[PDB]
Amino acid sequence: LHKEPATLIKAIDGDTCKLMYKGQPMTFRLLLVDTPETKHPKKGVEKYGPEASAFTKKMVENAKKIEVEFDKGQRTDKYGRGLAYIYADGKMVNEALVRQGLAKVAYVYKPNNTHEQHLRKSEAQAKKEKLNIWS
Numbered sequence: 251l252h253k254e255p256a257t258l259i260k261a262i263d264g265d266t267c268k269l270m271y272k273g274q275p276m277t278f279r280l281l282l283v284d285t286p287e288t289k290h291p292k293k294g295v296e297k298y299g300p301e302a303s304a305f306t307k308k309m310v311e312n313a314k315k316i317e318v319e320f321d322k323g324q325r326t327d328k329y330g331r332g333l334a335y336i337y338a339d340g341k342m343v344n345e346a347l348v349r350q351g352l353a354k355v356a357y358v359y360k361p362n363n364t365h366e367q368h369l370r371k372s373e374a375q376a377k378k379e380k381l382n383i384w385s
């Protein structure tokens with residue numbers, strides 16, 4: 251994979267944000283994870299939804315550098331959102347959330363699963379530590 255610079259435009263929730271990428275603004279959705287909903291009426295405000303949003307917001311707003319790393323398959327989803335692993339000062343936001351029990355590993359669609367095992371190992375640790383979503 252290969253990291254590329256991006257500039258934060260606006261944090262939306264735990265797993266979705268707006269970034270300036272290659273000159274253009276677009277919304278990104280974190281690969282392989284799912285933070286709880288705080289927007290869609292069908293799901294309502296789910297437990298830890300507000301917590302995941304705050305964690306992500308803090309993490310991306312305070313970073314000196316943001317980088318996007320597309321996987322080997324499709325780079326956007328059906329809603330036109332970029333699908334990537336996002337790094338804040340070298341730290342993967344996707345992993346950070348999973349490690350804290352603020353996201354579950356989900357939407358594993360091959361071949362966009364390069365970091366699946368890494369994320370799963372962090373999810374298991376969060377589970378055994380009974381963190382947030384796993385408490």
Ligand SMILES: Cc1cn([C@H]2C[C@H](OP(=O)(O)O)[C@@H](COP(=O)(O)O)O2)c(=O)[nH]c1=O
Nearest residue numbers: 266279280281282283284327328333357359
């Ligand atoms: C992370 C991810 C989400 N999605 C889709 C699946 C879900 O579609 P449906 O909404 O049609 O079920 C939605 C989940 O994202 P949200 O967690 O942002 O809702 O985005 C992908 O298509 N591929 C991905 O890699």
Ligand SMILES: [Ca+2]
Nearest residue numbers: 265284285286
């Ligand atoms: Ca979500």
